[PDB]
Design a protein around this ligand. Structure first.
Ligand SMILES: CCc1ccc(S(N)(=O)=O)cc1
Ligand SMILES: CCc1ccc(S(N)(=O)=O)cc1
Ligand SMILES: OC[C@H]1O[C@@H](O)[C@H](O)[C@@H](O)[C@@H]1O
Ligand SMILES: [Zn+2]
Length: 257
């Protein structure tokens, strides 16, 4: 199956997922000079006060922190979005070294990692139906740079020892994703896709301009996870990022003048 190695990584994905060469693939490089301020964007609303996290899972590609999405609690609205999008999970992409790891780039700059908060459009009822729609998903992307520790990330870091290998999960209740945001909600937005197979072209991307800082020790613990399952040869979970894809017939809009 697909992965990030030489033999199953991004350059191979198109053989089983031909949309990999599609017209609205993600991630992309964000050329900050070409992105245009858009006065039609409404204020962005990140409403996570009632978020209910449930579990953390090593799925062999990354780790997902999963939320109860059976009611409107943690939701994303406004900005480029029509209607209400419900938080289902977050995960990260990261590198083997601090100089790489993000999926989106900013004027070709790669960050050490990138956080994706994944939401589905409630008009479609369930995530599965949403990924059959052009406006089914909204992903809030946040860059990570290495510097001071992010206190709100530490609970995630400290559970990773218990989900080292593919298929392991652990209870992860009462985690507040508000502790992963930066101060500013300035953002860029464009229409794109999932960045892993099945690469479906359903996503409104909202990428925050301000990175969060995490400590070297925090990101080093991400890099101790394993792609492999228990009992199998150790393959460190690093460099689980897809590189930038062709922008094709798209424009990136900025929320800020
Ligand atoms: C083996 C092998 C290698 C690559 C893939 S793919 N096209 O990346 O899903 C699947 C299976
Ligand atoms: C199908 C699950 C899924 C959800 C979100 C992503 S991503 N990396 O946020 O585009 C990829 C895959
Ligand atoms: O035709 C002019 C229009 O061109 C579009 O490509 C831009 O997105 C708009 O902001 C602009 O007003
Ligand atoms: Zn992602």
């Amino acid at each position: 199956h697909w992965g990030y190695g030489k033999h199953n990584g991004p350059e191979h994905w198109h053989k089983d997922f031909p949309i990999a060469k599609g017209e609205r693939q993600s991630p992309v490089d964000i050329d900050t000079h070409t992105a245009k301020y858009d006065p039609s964007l409404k204020p962005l609303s990140v409403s996570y006060d009632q978020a209910t996290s449930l579990r953390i899972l090593n799925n062999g590609h990354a780790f997902n922190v999963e939320f109860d999405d059976s009611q409107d609690k943690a939701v994303l609205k406004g900005g480029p979005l029509d209607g209400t999008y419900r938080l289902i999970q977050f995960h990260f992409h990261w590198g083997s070294l601090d100089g790489q790891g993000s999926e989106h780039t900013v004027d070709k700059k790669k960050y050490a990692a990138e956080l994706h908060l994944v939401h589905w459009n409630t008009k479609y009822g369930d995530f599965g139906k949403a990924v059959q729609q052009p406006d089914g998903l909204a992903v809030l992307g946040i860059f990570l740079k290495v510097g001071s520790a992010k206190p709100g990330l530490q609970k995630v870091v400290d559970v990773l020892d218990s989900i080292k290998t593919k298929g392991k999960s652990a209870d992860f209740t009462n985690f507040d994703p508000r502790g992963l945001l930066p101060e500013s909600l300035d953002y860029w937005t464009y229409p794109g896709s999932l960045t892993t197979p099945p690469l479906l072209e359903c996503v409104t991307w909202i990428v925050l301009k301000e990175p969060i800082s995490v400590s070297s020790e925090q990101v080093l613990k991400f890099r101790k996870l394993n792609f492999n399952g228990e009992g199998e040869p150790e393959e460190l979970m690093v460099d689980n990022w897809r590189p930038a894809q062709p922008l094709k017939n798209r424009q990136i809009k900025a929320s800020f003048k």
